Structure formats: C-alpha cells, structure tokens
Write a protein that binds this DNA or RNA. Structure first.
Ligand code: MG
Ligand code: MG
Ligand code: MG
Ligand code: MG
Ligand code: MG
Ligand code: MG
Ligand code: MG
Ligand code: MG
Ligand code: MG
Ligand code: MG
Ligand code: MG
Ligand code: MG
Ligand code: MG
Ligand code: MG
Ligand code: MG
Ligand code: MG
Ligand code: MG
Ligand code: MG
Ligand code: MG
Ligand code: MG
Ligand code: MG
Ligand code: MG
Ligand code: MG
Ligand code: MG
Ligand code: MG
Ligand code: MG
Ligand code: MG
Ligand code: MG
Ligand code: MG
Ligand code: MG
Ligand code: MG
Ligand code: MG
Ligand code: MG
Ligand code: MG
Ligand code: MG
Ligand code: MG
Ligand code: MG
Lengths: 126, 79, 59, 136, 192
RNA sequence: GUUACGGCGGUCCAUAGCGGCAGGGAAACGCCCGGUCCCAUCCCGAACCCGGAAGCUAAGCCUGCCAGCGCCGAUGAUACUACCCAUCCGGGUGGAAAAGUAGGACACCGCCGAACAC
RNA sequence: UUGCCUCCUAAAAUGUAACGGAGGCGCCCAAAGGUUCCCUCAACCUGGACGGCAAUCAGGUGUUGAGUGUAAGUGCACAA
RNA sequence: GAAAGAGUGCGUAAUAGCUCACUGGUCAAGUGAUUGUGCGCCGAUAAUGUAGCGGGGCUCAAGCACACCGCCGAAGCCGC
RNA sequence: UUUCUUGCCGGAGGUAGAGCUACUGGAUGGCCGAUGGGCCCCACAGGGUUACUGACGUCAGCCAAACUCCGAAUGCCGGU
C-alpha cells in the first residue's frame, strides 16, 4: 500500500544536475589536442576524467576510490589535491597540456576549488 | 457599405536557400527562419535574426539529433 | 544493343519539358528515324516521351 | 435550425467538394440509416425539415441520430448592389455532404414504417439517397 | 453452438496494383489478401456474387474454407471494405485460423419484445466483442424485454451468453436503454 | 574473464517511455549526523557548502517478469497524382499514401573505473 | 485605403493579386544590458478562526498544460 | 376450428346489408418480390419561318455497344 | 557546352489525403455519477424517499484556408 503523490528529491536533483551540466556541455567541445576534463563528485568520493568528444573515449582518469589516495589521512580537500596532482602526471605522461574544465554542473568551491588550484600548480595549463 | 480589411505586409523571402550535398563558401548563409526550426551544429553560427550560416568550407549536411533538425558542414577533402 | 526511335505526333501541344526531351532525343521533324544506345538514360527518355515516339529494337 | 454556437472566423472560402466520403461511411448507432449518392450542399433548414418529417411520421417510438452538422457558412450580397466592394453577410449555414455519407439514422422495430419514414425523409432532400441497414 | 464451413474457389493474383485491382473489379472479381501467423501472406481473387451470397447467408462473420490450386485453407473473414455507393465488395481480409484457437469476434445484437405505452426504445450499442472458439462463433444475439417501466437500463454484461464465450467488453457497456416516452412539448423544445 | 557494480557517451533518441509485481549493499551509489572554520538563504545548513561514518537499501538506482497504458509496423486494398488517349461521360503506364490490420516490443552498443579469479 | 509588421488565401524552394479574410506599429528598458553562480513550475488532495470556490501552504503522482515587456508567428524546461 | 384480422375500405345518424382477409371444390405451371445493370417513355411551354442531326433522308440504321480488315482525308511526312 | 534532357545518389518542407483519450474550436446519443461543482422535508443523517442539473471518466461516430501526434505524386537546389 504505497501511493506516490508528487515529486521525489533524489530523482529531481539528479535531473537538475544533468540540467545544469548541459549548459557547459553545449558550449564546450573537445578535440584531440584540447580534450575536455570532466569532474564528477559524490558524497564520499570524487572522480575526474579526460575525454575527447571526437571519439567519445577517455584518455586519462583518476578517482578517490584508489587505495593510494584512500590511505591519505586528510580530508576531502587533501583527497582532491592528491587526485588533481595524480591526474596531472597522468595527463602529462599521456601528452596533453591544453584542456578545458567541465565542472559537471557543480558549483565552484571547496573540493572543486582545491582540485582546480592543484591542477594549476601541477603545471597543467588550462 | 464598405470593408475595413485589405491591408497586408511585404514578403521577406524566408526559407532554406542552401541545400545538402553542395559546396558553400565561408560565411555563407544557409537558412533564413523566424525561430529555431533548424539548429546549429559543427561550424554553424547563429545570427541576430535566428539565421544559420557556415563558418568553414565544405558541404552542408542535414541530420536529426535527439528530436531536432541540425545542419553541419563536413570538411570536404582537399584535391 | 541499339534502338530505332521514330516520332509519331507533333511537337506543339506539348510542354517545355517534353519538347526538350524530344530535342535531346534528336527528333526534329515527324517520322524521323534516329539510332541510339540502350542506356537507362534513353530508357527514361522513352518512358517520359512514349506518347510521341515509337521504339524498335535491333540487335 | 442547427447553428454552431460560435466560430473562430465567420467567413470561409468556397469549400472543396471532391472525392468520396471516408468518414462516417458505415452506419453504427442503431439499425437503419440513409446513405447519399451525389455531391451537394445540405442546409440546416433542410436538416430541420427532414428531422421534422421523420418524427412527424414515426410518432411515439424510436429515436433519431444525425451524423452531420451544418456549420459551413455561405455569404450573399443583397440585390441591387454592384459586385465587389467586399464580402457579403452570411445568410445560411450549410453542411457539405460527400457521396456515400450517412445522413440520418433510425432505430425502430418494424421494417414497414421504418422504410416508410426513411423514404419520407428521402423525398425532402435535394439529392438521391438509399436505405441502408446495420447488416453489411 | 456449432457451425459448418462455406466452400468457395479462388485464384492467386497475377498482377498487383490499383490498375489491376480495378480491372478485376470491373470484370466482377473482388481482390482479397490472406495473411496470418504462418508468416506467409497471400493475395487472391474471389467471386463477388458467391461472396455476397455467402455473406448474406451467414452474416458478417462466417468461417470459410479457401481453395487455392486445390489446397485447403481455414480462414476467418475479419476485416473488409465496402463501396459507399455501389454497396459492392472491394477488399476483404482473411485470417488463417486452425481448430482450437481463441479469437476476438464482434457480433451484432438484436432486441425484441413488447413495450409499455410509456416506454421508449433506445439502442446505443449494437455490436459487442466476444472471445470464442473458431467453430463456435454465433451469428446473432437476441435480448427480450417485457413490461419494462421507468429506468430499465439493459447492461451488456447482463445479457445471457452461451457456453464457451468470454465477454471482452467491460461490464460498464450498455446495449439497450428504456426511458419515459417523449412529449410534444419536449419535441418542440428540442432543436430550438 | 566473471559480477544483481559506478562514471562518460552514442542512435534519423519512446521496439528505448509510463505503470504494476519481486530482489540488492563487498566496494561503491544513496539516505544520515552536527554546523568551529570556506560558503548561503530574497528566512531557514531546505539547497549549496563544512566536518565524519553511529545507523539503514525503504525511497532514488539497478536487475528480472508482466502487454495495463503508451510506441513501432508490414503484405494487400482505398484516397491522390505526373503524363497521354477518348466529341462532355472516362480509361492506359509510372509513384504510392494516411488510418486500420497480422504482429513486434519491458532497448542495443563503445571507453574507463570498483569486488573475485587468472 | 495609400507606410511598415503577423498569419491564411499561396497549389509542400523563393515569389505570386484583388475594395479577399483577421490584427497591430511611429515605444520601453540605466536596466528588461553583460559576466558568473544558486534553484524550477503551474495542474494537484487536505485543511490550527477569519481565510471562503480561489490569499500563502508543506507533504509529495507533476516533462510544460504557469510563463519568457508591447499583436501574430517560431521556439525556449539543455532555458531566451 | 378450415378462418374470422378489435377488421383494408367504398355503407347507413346508430342498427342492418355489399364485401374482404385466411381457408375448402374444378382446370392445369409457372407465379411474386426486392437486387445490380445497357437502352429506352413521360416529366418538355415563346415569340419573322421548319429552326434543338447542317440538309435530304436513315430502323430493309446511314443510330448505339464490342472486335477485324480496308480506304478518303492538310501547305504534316516521303519523291523530283 | 559552363546550357538542356534523362538514370542514380544527398537533401528540408508541409500542400492532397487521413486523423484525433494528441493540441485550438465545432458536434451526436448513452453509462457510475459520489458531489446543480447542490435542493420533499434545511439537523450534524433517508432522495429528483421526486421528472432536473449532472463534472471528471468512458463507450463510439464526424467537421475546420488561419488545427497537425502524420503525410505523398509533383516542382525546386546541388553533384555524378
Ligand atoms: Mg540584436
Ligand atoms: Mg544578443
Ligand atoms: Mg475522419
Ligand atoms: Mg434529393
Ligand atoms: Mg558496507
Ligand atoms: Mg541539515
Ligand atoms: Mg528498495
Ligand atoms: Mg528507493
Ligand atoms: Mg503512438
Ligand atoms: Mg513502451
Ligand atoms: Mg506496401
Ligand atoms: Mg493531349
Ligand atoms: Mg462523354
Ligand atoms: Mg502505415
Ligand atoms: Mg507569413
Ligand atoms: Mg513558400
Ligand atoms: Mg502581379
Ligand atoms: Mg490599424
Ligand atoms: Mg541582469
Ligand atoms: Mg509541500
Ligand atoms: Mg538575457
Ligand atoms: Mg435487377
Ligand atoms: Mg448526319
Ligand atoms: Mg492509306
Ligand atoms: Mg496533300
Ligand atoms: Mg516539310
Ligand atoms: Mg560537359
Ligand atoms: Mg525525397
Ligand atoms: Mg522528410
Ligand atoms: Mg507551420
Ligand atoms: Mg483536406
Ligand atoms: Mg483535445
Ligand atoms: Mg468511426
Ligand atoms: Mg483551400
Ligand atoms: Mg492542415
Ligand atoms: Mg511550389
Ligand atoms: Mg539534376
């Protein structure tokens, strides 16, 4: 005896996340030389990927679920800085030096801000 | 007895005037339309009056993409 | 293969398109015998102007 | 005297009356119906007279269905007026009927007076028509 | 309720198209198509006179046997087209059905009886959909009313039905309605 | 390689949607606890964000099954029409609808990343 | 009525007349400009007294039916 | 009961009568109805004079319906 | 020969037609009909115990140059 009578918060906010990410998705186009750096976030971990929209394939990726970054005693800021540095050496080894930042629909600040500052200080210019 | 109607406007000659499969120049205007009957794709720009033009040389290709009408200019191979 | 094409009616009383297709065929005056190939192009020509021409097959 | 309550625009061009009726080609509300044969303009006054004729004969029992509605308007200028100078005022509303369309439908027990009343309606319409039953 | 099949002869079509179909119609043969679950549609020609006679004899729905170059097929007349003016036959759809299948059948219903002076006869629904076996299709359904007064709405689900038939239509459907007889005042008021 | 595992994407974006019935917490995804510090409310830690894992798969999500509603769709016929003959009446060749019908149908695929095994 | 704009007539490229059918225009915004960021309605069932048929409303089916200065037309929930 | 119909009518103020419906006797095979069709008939009446096949005339079609074989027929085509 | 014609290839339309529990209007007859979103006694509780009104839904069947969830043949543009 379960009767739904409105809207649900999780579904509507997932839809809204795609809604506000489509803004930057529409304008951002990524090629082989300048791919798109997309970032995803959760309540517990964060995720970063670099993709080329020409083929829809990812070049380098990193996340907070890996044991090396999980072993860090720091906070989400420490994890974000660590994963930003890591994805920086991964991108440099892959051979990409100009990219674009896709916030993924999230507002800037906190973990995303630390990720951005880590990416800039790591030597990856974008 | 008389009539109060009978006035009209001019014709601004709207519509699609460049079709797919042909070659177009840089900055060539493709479609004249009021709203978004067509949508820009790759190498397609939008004017102030919702017109569609080309940014690159090549051939115009119409297509459908998630319930939409979009135009593209493919980079035709250099001879 | 080759085709023998002969015009049976006149050019007037027919539209611009049929007249120009006839000129392509090469038929200018009535009862003229003109030889052509068996291409799909000529097949379409005869299909379009079949009410003015009579076709014979040789070879 | 069937007249639509309101119409978005009060004047319309000459309707096309070409082709064979596709909608309402088969009778299904009751048992018996009338099917037309030719192209025509059937007016609301004609519909009223025909319905009066049908009831005026069928009396107590039965009931009537009408599958058409005279909402197409027509204009007419008054006489002693030079032609042109705008459109005339609309005088009678008409329902354009296509061949084979079902006009009236009846459901009464007995064939005798059923066909009699249907013929009574037939004799008041301007075009030829025939009786049709529910059986195909 | 048991029925017997109807025997007729038919030939396969030679040419397909509006021109060929209309030529056959002018000749006096009706074009028909035979398609079913066998994944093998066929198009054939029938005799208009024999077909009309069988239709008149066994109603709108009858079980038919098709003779195609000596082959025996079991089919049901399911959909068809009739000319608005010539009341002739131009197309019929025949569905292959084997013995022991459930099919959807639309059957006409008739009403008979004697009415009281204050009773007005009304028939809103004349055809109902019934699921039954191929050889058990009924041709007509009858309902009887005797001494009906005031509101005596006859429900489609209230109609007595034979064995082995299922009422596809919902019980909310009404077939026969009985109301008070009209009056001259109401007759002259309506339509004004 | 397997998995009842999460991200980024595709397709002339509904055969892919809605609804109903069952099952999931290893890691993850969610809900959750409290606002010292970043940050915010046209008020409010609702949202964003800040700090953690005490608790929980019920919602969300996924998987599986249902044709209840949506969706796709023949062959054949009918309407239409390009052209032409025929003293109005009409026919011949070419193209072939829409609706409806038998049916189909509870998406498929690509790149990375999570647990087990090699 | 004479200028301009919206739609149809206009026969699926543009165009295409009539004393044919329907309506408007001789502004406004120092923000209704621009950047960036947060969020999505109206329809919906119920009511501590007013407050009711509607005021505001939380719960929680809700993919646009609210709406996006000024007529019509095209779009826009991926937002304008 | 062979068949009497709250009677299809022309009958009398109202009765009464002429009838009729279904049925029974002789004769002795077609008799009815709608259905789709090709031709037909009426519906049909204006003014100087036939005057709505061009006219004579045409069913012993020289009319109509369907096939076949031919001919005449322009300044079109071919020949000099 | 860039021209024309034809076969094929790549194209967007929105006419003919058809349709509506698909939008804007028009329209025929039914069913529960609580609640006229409501009145024979106003009870704060038995019915049009009374012929109305009956919304939503549903059975179905039509119409629209300024309606299109659909949609040809043509014609038009470009290449071979
Ligand atoms: Mg501007
Ligand atoms: Mg601008
Ligand atoms: Mg229709
Ligand atoms: Mg008449
Ligand atoms: Mg766990
Ligand atoms: Mg909180
Ligand atoms: Mg659950
Ligand atoms: Mg849940
Ligand atoms: Mg659909
Ligand atoms: Mg579906
Ligand atoms: Mg087909
Ligand atoms: Mg001609
Ligand atoms: Mg004729
Ligand atoms: Mg179809
Ligand atoms: Mg316009
Ligand atoms: Mg145009
Ligand atoms: Mg002009
Ligand atoms: Mg004005
Ligand atoms: Mg601003
Ligand atoms: Mg709330
Ligand atoms: Mg703006
Ligand atoms: Mg006959
Ligand atoms: Mg003569
Ligand atoms: Mg000769
Ligand atoms: Mg000569
Ligand atoms: Mg000469
Ligand atoms: Mg050349
Ligand atoms: Mg095309
Ligand atoms: Mg298309
Ligand atoms: Mg339009
Ligand atoms: Mg139309
Ligand atoms: Mg609607
Ligand atoms: Mg219908
Ligand atoms: Mg028109
Ligand atoms: Mg339209
Ligand atoms: Mg055109
Ligand atoms: Mg071309």
């Amino acid at each position: 005896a379960h009767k739904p009578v409105g809207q649900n918060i999780s579904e509507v906010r997932r839809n809204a996340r795609l809604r506000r990410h489509a803004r930057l998705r529409k304008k951002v186009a990524g090629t082989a030389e300048v791919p798109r750096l997309v970032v995803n976030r959760s309540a517990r971990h964060i995720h970063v990927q670099l993709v080329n929209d020409l083929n829809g394939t990812t070049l380098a990726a990193a996340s907070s679920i890996e044991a090396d970054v999980r072993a860090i005693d720091g906070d989400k800021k420490a994890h974000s800085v660590r994963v930003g540095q890591l994805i920086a050496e991964r991108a440099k080894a892959a051979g990409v030096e100009t990219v674009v930042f896709d916030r993924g629909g999230y507002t800037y600040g906190g973990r995303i801000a630390a990720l951005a500052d880590a990416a800039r200080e790591a030597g990856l210019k974008f | 007895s008389s009539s109060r109607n009978g006035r009209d406007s001019a014709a601004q000659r709207l519509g699609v005037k460049r079709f797919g499969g042909q070659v177009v120049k840089a900055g060539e205007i493709l479609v004249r339309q009021r709203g978004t009957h067509f949508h820009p794709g790759v190498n397609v720009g939008r004017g102030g009056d919702d017109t569609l033009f080309a940014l690159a040389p090549g051939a115009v290709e119409f297509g459908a993409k998630r319930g939409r009408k979009t135009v593209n200019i493919v980079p035709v191979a250099r001879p | 293969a080759e085709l023998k094409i002969t015009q049976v009616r006149s050019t007037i009383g027919a539209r611009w398109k049929q007249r120009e297709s006839l000129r392509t065929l090469g038929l200018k005056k009535i009862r003229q015998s003109v030889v052509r190939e068996d291409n799909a192009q000529t097949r379409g020509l005869i299909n379009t102007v079949h009410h003015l021409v009579e076709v014979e097959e040789v070879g | 005297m069937l007249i639509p309550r309101k119409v978005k625009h009060r004047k319309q061009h000459h309707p096309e009356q070409r082709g064979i009726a596709s909608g309402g080609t088969s009778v299904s509300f009751g048992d018996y119906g009338i099917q037309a044969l030719e192209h025509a303009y059937i007016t609301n006054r004609q519909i009223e007279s025909a319905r009066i004729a049908i009831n005026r004969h069928i009396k107590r029992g039965g009931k009537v269905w009408i599958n058409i509605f005279p909402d197409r308007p027509l204009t007419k200028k008054p006489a002693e007026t030079r032609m042109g100078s705008g459109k005339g005022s609309p005088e009678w509303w008409v329902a354009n009927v296509k061949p084979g369309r079902v006009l009236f439908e009846l459901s009464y027990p007995d064939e005798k007076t059923a066909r009699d009343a249907l013929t009574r309606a037939i004799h008041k319409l301007p075009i030829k028509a025939r009786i049709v039953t529910r059986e195909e | 309720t048991a029925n017997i099949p109807n025997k007729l002869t038919a030939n396969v079509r030679t040419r397909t198209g509006k021109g060929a179909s209309r030529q056959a119609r002018r000749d006096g043969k009706v074009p028909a198509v035979l398609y079913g679950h066998g994944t093998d549609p066929q198009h054939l020609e029938l005799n208009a006179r024999d077909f009309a006679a069988v239709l008149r004899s066994h109603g709108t729905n009858a079980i038919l046997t098709l003779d195609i170059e000596g082959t025996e097929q079991l089919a049901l007349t399911k959909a068809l087209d009739v000319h608005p003016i010539r009341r002739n036959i131009q197309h019929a759809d025949l569905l292959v059905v084997q013995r022991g299948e459930k099919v959807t059948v639309e059957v006409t219903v008739l009403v008979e009886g004697d009415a009281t002076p204050g009773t007005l006869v009304t028939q809103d629904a004349n055809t109902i959909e019934i699921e039954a076996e191929a050889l058990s299709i009924p041709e007509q359904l009858t309902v009887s009313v005797e001494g009906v007064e005031a509101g005596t709405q006859i429900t489609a689900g209230q109609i007595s039905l034979p064995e082995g038939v299922n009422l596809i239509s919902d019980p909310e459907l009404l077939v026969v309605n009985v109301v008070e007889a009209p009056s001259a005042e109401a007759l002259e008021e309506e339509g004004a």
